[PDB]
Amino acid sequence: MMNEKILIVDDQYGIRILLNEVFNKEGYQTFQAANGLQALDIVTKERPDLVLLDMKIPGMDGIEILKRMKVIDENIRVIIMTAYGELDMIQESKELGALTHFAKPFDIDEIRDAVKKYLPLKSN
């Protein structure tokens, strides 16, 4: 057994696995969602130590989801992902108490730093 979990929501395009195989390589329990609520439940279900969700979402942007999510509790930790075009939102996410903000073009290696910086990860 291990000690690490992570959740992925939207932005799924073969990247979720990339980081998956990473956390999975350790035996960590990771899950995926296709919305906020679904992530809210899957959040506690897998009670991960980190969650990755992308704002850009079909049918009710995450602007609110991520909002209500954090507004719900200040202990919720989730990462946002979107091109550096809606800095406006990305900004708020900061004052919202978000972990950070990544741009479409992102590297896992980089995410391994924040994760390895926030969580007891072991990335090269």
* The Cα angle at residue 85 between residues 116 and 68, in degrees rounded to 5: 65
The reply to whether 113 sits in an annotated binding site is no
By what technique were these coordinates determined? NMR
The reply to whether 41 sits in an annotated binding site is no
What CATH number is given for 1-124 in this structure?
A: 3.40.50.2300
**Cα–Cα distance measured from residue 86 to residue 78, given in angstroms and rounded to the nearest whole number:** 18
**Cα–Cα distance measured from residue 21 to residue 43, given in angstroms and rounded to the nearest whole number:** 19
Return the residue matching tokens 């919202």. 96
- DSSP 3-state of 45: helix
Nearest to 79 by CA among 46, 121, 22, 39: 39
Cβ pair 28, 2 in contact under 8 A: yes
The reply to whether 11 sits in an annotated binding site is yes
Q: Give the start-to-end residue ranges of the domains of the chain.
A: 1-124
The reply to whether 56 sits in an annotated binding site is yes
**Cα–Cα distance measured from residue 124 to residue 121, given in angstroms and rounded to the nearest whole number:** 10
Q: Where are the alpha helices (DSSP H) in 1-118?
A: 15-26, 37-46, 62-72, 87-96, 108-118
Rounded to an integer, what is the distance from CA 81 to the centroid of its chain? 8
